[PDB]
Amino acid sequence: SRLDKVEAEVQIDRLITGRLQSLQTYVTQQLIRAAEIRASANLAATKMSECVLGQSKRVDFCGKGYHLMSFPQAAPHGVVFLHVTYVPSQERNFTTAPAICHEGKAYFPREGVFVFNGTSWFITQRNFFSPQIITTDNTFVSGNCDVVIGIINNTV
Amino acid sequence: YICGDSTECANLLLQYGSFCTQLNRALSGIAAEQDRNTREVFAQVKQMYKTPTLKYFGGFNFSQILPDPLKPTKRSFIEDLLFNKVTLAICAQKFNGLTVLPPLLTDDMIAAYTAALVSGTATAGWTFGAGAALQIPFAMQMAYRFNGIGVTQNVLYENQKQIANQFNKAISQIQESLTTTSTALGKLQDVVNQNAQALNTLVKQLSSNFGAISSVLNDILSRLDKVEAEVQIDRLITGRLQSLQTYVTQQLIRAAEIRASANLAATKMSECVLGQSKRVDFCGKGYHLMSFPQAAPHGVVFLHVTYVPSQERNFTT
Amino acid sequence: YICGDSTECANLLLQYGSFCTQLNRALSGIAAEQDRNTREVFAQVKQM
Amino acid sequence: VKSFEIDKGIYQTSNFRVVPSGDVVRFPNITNLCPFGEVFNATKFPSVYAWERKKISNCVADYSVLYNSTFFSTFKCYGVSATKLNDLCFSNVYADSFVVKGDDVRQIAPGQTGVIADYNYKLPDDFMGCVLAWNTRNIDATSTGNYNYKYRYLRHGKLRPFERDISNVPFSPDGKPCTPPALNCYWPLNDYGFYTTTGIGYQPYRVVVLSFELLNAPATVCGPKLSTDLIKNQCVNFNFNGLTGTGVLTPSSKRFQPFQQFGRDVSDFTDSVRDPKTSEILDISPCSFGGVSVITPGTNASSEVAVLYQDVNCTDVSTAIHADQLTPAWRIYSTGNNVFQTQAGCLIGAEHVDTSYECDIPIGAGICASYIVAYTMSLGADSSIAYSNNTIAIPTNFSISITTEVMPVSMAKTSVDCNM
């Protein structure tokens, strides 16, 4: 209404410069948010290719337990995973020996630790309690009885 | 920073809209994200254990790895060496406007986290994390750790003293190679130096002019009358505003790189510490038998106990 | 780039602080970190 | 945050700063009247090639005799402003007097050489004070002729600023000591031709240049102001000899120099000054400032807030509240207690509690609030384990615990019509 000349062109230069810095700022910060969101999306594609398509043995990546399965679901703009974990908890107390000195020779069990020397009875798994009757398949010939800490006889 | 105080320079600031709200929001979001980084890296054990106060198991000197009650500080000795190594190039009160707020998760709590992680690594069995513990006497632990490596259990027990001696001498060599050594602790000082460069450059941009008469306010205030006043003050506000906004953008980019490194760090403290991560040349550089955390100024310092075999022979197959 | 060379335009560039130094340091840091990119990709073998 | 329901958390908000209370001016005790009435109302005035530079010091100027008078034809200041001129005790001001024609007002400037300002009187390009000229057609200009004043127009080169040539050299463009009237060998001197009834451009003007040597000494030429006394450890305003500002004063720890006066500690930040009445005081110009932040439990279990100030020590805060000095000045506002450690500042409205919780709300350095209490922190469920021999725990019953996890993969696909 009240403008005349290059005066107003100076004023509109001020307006354009301010709005142009604001828009440039918007573009730059949305680009930074895009970088973070695509890093997260790469993690998400990695978890869908890993956790959902197979059992990913890496720990505290997919779930918080031991990651038995995974079920994806969509979202507004996102994705929501449902990690089917596996949490073991009823702790016990049983003694052990790292070896079996049957007849002067070492019997280490299976790579697959804890010889159950709970009164020298079995050899089990690591996580789930499962006693198995000890046989020659459950261990192997290993040297002599030099580094055996716990003597266990009657290897059947 | 922008326009220290006059009366009217604040009004000329309000003529440029609401940038101050944006900058406070952006820096507060950056600060909250760094606190989130520290929570995500360190706060991964709910069940904080206690130091077993033997610190020697079989032949395994955990001396200087865990903190000592007999020492005055509650940090371990290697952490103290690392704190001494990293330089820094009542309350603070400076009329920059600038400040460095303190971190939330304070340094002795960080050290308690590291001691808890090392303790539950050394104690508490292989099943650490998802569960509580298993009461495993740490020879059985690394007897088991010889099975994510493809060797049998014969290796540990038949060679216990030699493994323990190599382990202890390696830790003592780590001490000697962290005391009087050099730039192989560089990245943390790179972080601190870049922060110093950015902030000191920002202060120097306050010291500079931007085509105005003087490079400071309250000088041209003494010789202002009218619109000439607003000319020089608008020039100063525009220059300081571009400099400060450039600072904000570069802080945000450095925060992006630092959270990429933080995600790698949280990943490795999950993978390498809490179990034996069989992926190769990710945790260590050998076969990743163990890994320990240690705190740091602004970072994390691991110790990867690898496994490098070298006495080759010749055998036909 | 800014102010190719005249006489006094260089002085007006001096009137805007040390922006020239900041940009040179930023591009130098870009160069060094991408050298680090190439080293950490390819130079991973001790024994060629 | 533009809402009514507001959930639980520290929410950053506006800035607090202490309003200064007092008003402190410290000048020298020098009292005199300036020779302005001497120099401006004088008889003898030199020409341009012999312009005279007079020192004025140990005075009290007024700077209203310069304004409350229509004696002045052209009065233009360059480095300073007009009305705010007596707010600065200058250092050893210099009056440069000469007499020009009714044309040469356009020349005398930083730059804009012309002839006589290029040949007879040169200015620098920054250090200027105020230039004044007035018409004196009714004193010396006889219509018969005032042939007593001269200038020089023949110089081998231009001038450096504030430099004066007097010697009548027999100017010849190739060295050549000549005998004028030889060819190309003249005198550089030339008259004016000041007449009474001629045009305005041929009328005599008297020109006074006021160069202001800004504050390279303990200042002597002040203005008509009144000094008060020092108010230490309390936020006040400043006006020293040439410096204003707003801050908190305190005695120093300096090895200061007899010629020095300012402190400019790291990068134009004054921080220490030398009082004009024999003292040396530091300057914490940061009185107190920062940003407040509200702690709220969430407007659905409570309605009581707690204000966290950030960079303070809870000693200026109590005084500034209970004497109404804070810029977020409230109306309904009280203080039951004042928690302060973990140097993130004043925690107004909280209770120290040894029984620490799971760190609901992140206050500063360790300390976390709740509910309103503000404990330090329980980092986790504390325990110890039996670390004896062969006895080993093994889980026998397990569970399955499906856990969620959220990953954002796509922000808002936006676009800008950047012509609208």
Numbering used by the authors:
A (entry chain B): 964 to 1119
B (entry chain A): 723 to 811, 832 to 1059
C (entry chain C): 723 to 770
D (entry chain B): 290 to 660, 674 to 722
What does the paper say about this structure?
The spike (S) glycoprotein of the coronavirus is a class I viral fusion protein located on the outer envelope of the virion that plays a critical role in viral infection by recognizing host cell receptors and mediating fusion of the viral and cellular membranes. The S1 subunit contains a receptor-binding domain (RBD), while the S2 subunit contains a hydrophobic fusion peptide and two heptad repeat regions.
Our cryo-EM analysis of the SARS-CoV S glycoprotein and ACE2 complex sample captured three ACE2-bound and two ACE2-free conformational states of the trypsin-cleaved and low-pH-treated SARS-CoV S glycoprotein. The structure of one of the two ACE2-free states had one CTD1 in the “up” position and was determined at a resolution of 3.9 Å. Structural comparisons of the CTD1s from different ACE2-free conformational states showed that the “up” angles of the CTD1s were between 50° and 70°, while the angle for the CTD1s in the “down” position was approximately 22.7°. The CTD2s of the unbound-up and ACE2-bound conformations exhibited a hinge motion away from the spike axis compared to CTD2 in the unbound-down conformation. Here, our results showed that the prefusion architecture, either in the unbound or ACE2-bound state, was retained in the cleaved S glycoprotein, and the conformational heterogeneity of CTD1s still existed.
